[PDB]
Amino acid sequence: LARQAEDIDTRYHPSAALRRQLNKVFPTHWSFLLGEIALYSFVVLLITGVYLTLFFDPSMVDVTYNGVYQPLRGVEMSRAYQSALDISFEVRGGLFVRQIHHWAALMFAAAIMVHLARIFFTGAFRRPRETNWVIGSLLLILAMFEGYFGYSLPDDLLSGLGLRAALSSITLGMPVIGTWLHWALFGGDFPGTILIPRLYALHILLLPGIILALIGLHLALVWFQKHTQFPGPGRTEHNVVGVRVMPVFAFKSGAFFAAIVGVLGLMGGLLQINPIWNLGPYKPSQVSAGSQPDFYMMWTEGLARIWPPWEFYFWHHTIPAPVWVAVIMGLVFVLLPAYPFLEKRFTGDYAHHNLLQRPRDVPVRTAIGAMAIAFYMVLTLAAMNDIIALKFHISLNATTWIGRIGMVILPPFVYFITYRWCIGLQRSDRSVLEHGVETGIIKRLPHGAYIELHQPLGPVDEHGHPIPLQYQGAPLPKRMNKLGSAGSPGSGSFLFADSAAEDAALREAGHAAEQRALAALREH
């Protein structure tokens, strides 16, 4: 479209920033898409939530149902619960959309956690990027609380119990402020008339806006501080080796977006999540047996379950037990964003870093991370006590005490094992550096001796033994077939062979192109 392109060029003349953005190089490691997963989940959340806002009515006034769902006719409920039932049963395709919304929220949280694990273990938070780590931590906290406020909207029995217990009766117990916070937030005592509209406003407008601003800032910082990379053949602290945006990277990103949307649609159509009609409207007098929150608050619930009853009563006052949960939660949320500064104070290393570390080269940090993950898993499993004790025949008090003791003895055990495992991996790497790659072939050496036919990775000395290499922070091959050793199948389709000339030509050109890629990337 020559005329339109030229007229855009005389009116705006970008032609240089477009060239500067079309030539940007991005590294290609499978581990660098765990943030794209969360970004795409957030986009899907935005779209489905904008759809949902056209049918939801966030009031707490009481009505009688008089709808299509018969086992609930004549029951008195709030207006939000009725609006959610109307979305579920009386809009063509509404149940599908809210199920997609909930599944996308779950995938958002899970992808954020996996991305954080990557960032922590590879060491991508060092000198140039502590602030980007901090922004990520804030994003994590906001996502947690946004999901909570979200699933507490269509007030039914489970959401009501969660709200009541956690919000009302942990805010009510804080030492001095306490009830003042409770009355500022609820407008009075727990079941009010302004709670659900306030949560609705917080959930559709404020927190999404803050999250959008922080995500923009995060991606800008990642764009202008170029990406990190793993050590390798042609990689230095001064260059980025990968593919340009122009033909390839946008294509791969868009295809990944479409595949994630496909997975979300499939599992939002085939699996059922939050069937609010099986529950009832919230009433302060009735309860059920499974009262768990979504899996990103289960650690908070488990911590409240397995913490012993230690209260303090002094003059005319009372400090209850959930205060402990409050300070522990706050301590976790404060220890997460302040980790890079702690590590740089303790190790005393303040240099710029653009090459990542393999998790096996840093045993102490890997052990710390494994200990934290074990602690989190214990806290999460201690939240499904009832389900575990019912399905697997175990006592309930037994599960409580198992959690209460594991909380102390599992983290150090995991630390010890992880340290020893990292050093074992290092030794296994050094052995294949010193000798060659084991091929698995045995010989008998006419004077009855068995050898195993190693294969060298570099030069050899006078008597056939390879000269040992030096470690360079890059992974080493361990299987002979990963190196081209046994390959080149036929060149048919699946049941009929091709000609021999075609097979020879294709094999030979493929070999040539492989060798040229190798020789080109070495030499730079």
Binding site: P128, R244, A255, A258, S493, E502, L506, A513, A517
Partner: protein, 166 residues
């Protein structure tokens, strides 16, 4: 350069742009050096059938959404079982169509777009001293020229006023 930048072929222009940006693309290679073979036709046909499936089941999604019994019919007299399949069908058509499109795209990128390697010339670290000195001089002169440093009363009254308003 010159005005004689024309009469220059495509690859010299591309390498010139790359060197202007600091990018140095090494090892660009087509995927099918030999001409038409049966392997190329097979790969093209395989890439195409996925997109055909995606389009077919997008159409199936449209038809299902338009003509399927969707209203709540649950009871124990007329066991519907047609209403219990209304949301699974929406999901099964929608997700599978878009998944097929994504898989076709990935295959096309893996088997037809040429393979490449590039290098980017980070240029990290502190700025060149030129820019640091110039910008710090600009900031310092904008501050000292206002003479606000030797005006104590104005500054302190301004501070107290803004603080009280806030």
């Amino acid at each position: 350069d010159e005005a004689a930048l024309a009469a220059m072929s495509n690859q010299e222009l591309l390498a010139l742009g790359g060197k202007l940006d600091g990018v140095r693309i090494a090892y660009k290679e087509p995927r099918w050096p030999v001409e038409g073979t049966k392997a190329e036709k097979r790969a093209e046909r395989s890439v195409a059938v996925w997109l055909l499936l995606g389009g077919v089941f997008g159409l199936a999604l449209l038809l299902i959404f338009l003509f399927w019994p969707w209203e709540f019919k649950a009871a124990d007299g007329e066991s519907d079982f047609i209403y219990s399949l209304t949301t699974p069908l929406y999901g099964l058509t929608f997700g599978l169509s878009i998944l097929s499109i994504a898989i076709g795209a990935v295959l096309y990128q893996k088997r037809f777009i040429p393979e490449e390697i590039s290098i980017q010339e980070r240029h990290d670290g502190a700025s060149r001293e030129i820019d640091r000195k110039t910008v710090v001089a600009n900031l310092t002169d904008a501050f000292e020229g206002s003479t606000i440093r030797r005006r104590k009363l104005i500054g302190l009254s301004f501070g107290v006023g803004m603080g009280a308003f806030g």
